[PDB]
A paper describes a structure:
Glycan truncation likewise impacted packing of the D strand against the E strand to form a beta sheet. The low B-values (46 Å2) and resolution of this region are surprising; the same (1)GlcNAc residue of hIgG1 Fc with the same truncation does not reorient, is less resolved and is characterized by higher B values (105 Å2). This comparison in conjunction with the NMR data above indicates that mIgG2c Fc contains a sequence motif that provides more interactions to stabilize this critical region than are present in hIgG1 Fc, however, the rearrangements upon truncation, including the extension of the E strand, likely do not promote receptor binding as mIgG2c is more sensitive to glycan truncation than human IgG1 Fc (50-fold and 11-fold reduction, respectively).
With this expression and NMR technique we investigated mouse antibody fragments and characterized differences in structure and function between mouse IgG2b and 2c Fc. Here we demonstrate that mouse IgG2b and 2c have similar Fc structures for the complex-type N-glycoforms, however mIgG2c Fc binds FcγRIV with greater affinity.
Numbering used by the authors:
A (entry chain B): 237 to 443
B (entry chain A): 237 to 445
Amino acid sequence: GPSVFIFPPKIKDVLMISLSPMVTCVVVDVSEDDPDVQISWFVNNVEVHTAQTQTHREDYNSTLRVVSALPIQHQDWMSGKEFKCKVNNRALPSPIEKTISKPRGPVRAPQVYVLPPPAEEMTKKEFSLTCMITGFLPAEIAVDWTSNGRTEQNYKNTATVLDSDGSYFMYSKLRVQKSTWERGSLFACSVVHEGLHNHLTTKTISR
Amino acid sequence: GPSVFIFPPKIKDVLMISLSPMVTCVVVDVSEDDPDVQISWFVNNVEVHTAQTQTHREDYNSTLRVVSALPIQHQDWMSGKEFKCKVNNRALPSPIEKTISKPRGPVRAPQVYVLPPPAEEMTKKEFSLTCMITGFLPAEIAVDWTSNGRTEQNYKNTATVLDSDGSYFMYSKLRVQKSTWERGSLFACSVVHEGLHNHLTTKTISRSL
Ligand SMILES: *[C@@H]1O[C@H](CO)[C@@H](O)[C@H](O)[C@H]1NC(C)=O
Ligand SMILES: *[C@@H]1O[C@H](CO)[C@@H](O)[C@H](O)[C@H]1NC(C)=O
Ligand code: NA
Ligand code: NA
Ligand code: NA
Ligand code: NA
Ligand code: NA
Ligand code: NA
């Protein structure tokens, strides 16, 4: 029978004013036999009408998937409003309702350090800069690297890890060519998180 | 109906001759209407009778789960022998078999580095040491720390992550007391991997003396 998953906005979309956060309801395992699904949306129990809906056939398994995305405003998310989708379909005994909201909770800024390559690695052609990001709450975060305003396309983030502290940590590893490092370039680890002034901090390292 | 999952040994158990590596067959969704499950085990097609087999009740769901763990020899795993469990039940249209072995593939030793802590952190009462582990293949690795030669408790590991050259990396973070660090205590990140000589390396750090 059909199931419904509700998704919050991406952290970066809600913490940066130029972006476009979305709350999304996804209805999965809609039978070919009962294909018609009615989705309706609510913000603090007031019905709203701006959601964009798409329907995908999954012919291979005789099902369909319906995706409904509500475009939201950053302040409504940050102030705690409840976003609710109600899903109706003839194969359900009653409508399924899913709700989501920003959980109220403690907020700890991460400490962010950019660490140079180890001495033992300098003898190589390329090597690893480490962005260490510790002590943050809640777990939602975004971490990216740039150089001279160019997004580097060769870094890897670890998954976030719960520290024995109650807080979370992660690391991001940037691979850099020796030549780029020796010509004096600035590498910037930028971290987006609820704790940070203007929701953003950027730490830079070079030779 | 019932289904079967097979699991490999933990890498630390296999790489260390004092420990007891197991290969495990788990049978889920066994109906309490046909509760009896027979598991047999084979190592390159020869039947072995050393496994320990338990049944856990899941009465909330009128189901059972059967866990059969076969204690294996370290060299059978490492040399690529096939471990196989055959599962028989009354309600099964026919016996289910699962097989597992260690894939043959290239082996690249981990590069292990303990990163020196920033000065701002060392003035605090408690701070973090970071062990960075890169370029290893295969993914299976065990990482921990010692202080003065005794295995530490207060550390956390990241998951391994696939790097862009086809090797893996990870990081390990140990929490350290300033008072212990100032005492000149030795801190060591210990790494177990099949690519290392004697399957172990250590990298150490302490206060400047
Ligand atoms: C195929 O569809 C059924 C629903 O009719 C669902 O229960 C099952 O998970 C689907 N299979 C896969 C492999 O996604
Ligand atoms: C309850 O029993 C059925 C088998 O009859 C099983 O497939 C199902 O997964 C069980 N539900 C859970 C959550 O274990
Ligand atoms: Na909210
Ligand atoms: Na580094
Ligand atoms: Na540089
Ligand atoms: Na076999
Ligand atoms: Na094997
Ligand atoms: Na290994």
